[PDB]
Amino acid sequence: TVRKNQATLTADEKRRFVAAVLELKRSGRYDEFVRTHNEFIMSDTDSGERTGHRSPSFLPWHRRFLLDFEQALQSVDSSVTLPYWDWSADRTVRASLWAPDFLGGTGRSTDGRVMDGPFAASTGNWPINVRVDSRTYLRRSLGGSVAELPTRAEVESVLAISAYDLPPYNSASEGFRNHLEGWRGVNLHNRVHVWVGGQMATGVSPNDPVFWLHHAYVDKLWAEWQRRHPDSAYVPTGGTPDVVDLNETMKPWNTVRPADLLDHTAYYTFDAL
Amino acid sequence: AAPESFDEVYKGRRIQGRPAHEHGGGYEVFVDGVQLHVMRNADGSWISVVSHYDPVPTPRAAARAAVDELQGAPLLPF
Ligand SMILES: [Cu+2]
Ligand SMILES: [Cu+2]
Known part of the structure; x- marks a missing residue:
């Protein structure tokens, strides 16, 4: 089971991925992933218990959460795997990621509503149920709140950090995990959530299917750091x-x-590492 | 040692803050009377559940950022 760069998927792979995601939503399973993530986002704190975020386990926790989600996809269509979004390469609103045959594009300026692609509210196939902002349609503002996605040079600077994590093991830490997460430094992962906007910028960010492709790339970078x-x-x-x-x-x-999750190759490989 | 309370109308909406499946908040924020979950980071900055990845300096700034995000929409309680 190979995780591929989204930019390389065939038309058939895009179709099958989309259909499997929409079936998980239809069946009610998708929203429980959104709910789980939100509970951790809202509970992890820098001075108290912290597991999903702002802590060394940010990486293995998201690795296992993405494995749970990929396994659920595979229960609908066993050919489907999670693709990843290299936002250092595919950095504009014109990337095919954001085409109507894949995730659809940015939101309209009035209310941020996504108007095309399989997840646009007008399809009837993507209700936003698990929410805090009361609106029930997918929203995005690509590049709205922060002008640029991280660059390859910025990713390289973080990948060169030798220590995995350092005390106090939270959002103030130096080290690789917190620079990749983005609370310190040029900011990789947090800035991508902010760049997409809409639900991706909130405590219910898995409401946008790009969540999974973002975190699959963050997970790839952990694997690259390990090498x-x-x-x-x-x-x-x-x-x-x-x-x-x-x-x-x-x-x-x-x-x-975490020990059981350090080696991704037990579960999947990448198209290239 | 918690920030001061606040109360203002921002972009037509009432935002309030006060020292006090989610965390241990020593500070509460409200948007038109609905509680907004907010959180303080180690460096003193704040975030809220509708702008979780974009730290701002103060709880009032987090409330204003939530009003900006909501574009008029009512907040749902956590
Ligand atoms: Cu997260
Ligand atoms: Cu994230």
């Missing part, structure tokens, strides 16, 4: 309050540890 720094590994490694240590299990699953 660059084979003498560097997940920290902390035991006895840290409020923080998932290497061999501690992670909510919500409780049955998996």
Whole structure:
């Protein structure tokens, strides 16, 4: 099972991915992923328990969450895998990612409503149910709130950071995890959520299917970092309050540890690494 | 040590803040009387659940950012 750059999918792969996502939404399964993520986003805090975000487990937690979602996709269509969006390469509103045969484009200026693609509210196939902003249609403002996506040079600067994470293991940390997450530095992952806008900029960001392709690329960058720094590994490694240590299990699953997730090749490979 | 309270009309909407499936908030914000979940980061900045990835300096700034995001829409409670 190979995760491919979105820019390379065939028409058939795009069709099958879209259909499987829309079936997970139809059946009610999709919205429970949105709900799980929102609960962690709203509970993880820099001075208290933190698991999904703003913490060393940001990367293995999103790895397992994306595996849960890919497994659900595969239960509808076993050929489908999660594609990734290299936002350092495919950085304009003109990328085929945002075409009507894939995710559809940006929102209209009046109310941010996405008007084309399979997830536009007018299709009847993508109600926004799990929400805080009361509106029930997918919204985006590509490039609205921040002008540019991160560049390859910026990604490279973060990939060169040797330490995985550092105390205090939160949004103030130095180290790779927090620079990739983006709370410090040139800002990679947080800035992409802000760039897409709409629900992707909120606490219910998996409402936009681009969520998965963004995090699949963030997950790819972790794998690339591992290759660059084979003498560097997940920290902390035991006895840290409020923080998932290497061999501690992670909510919500409780049955998996960061240790079980460091090597993606047990689950999937990339088209190229 | 929590920020001061505030109360103003911003873009036609009432935003209020006060020291006090989601976190431990020592500060509460409201938009037209509906509570907006907000959070403080280690460096002192704030975010809210409708602008979670874009830290702003203060809870009033987070309330204003939420009003900007909502484009008139009522907030749903958390
Ligand atoms: Cu997240
Ligand atoms: Cu994210």
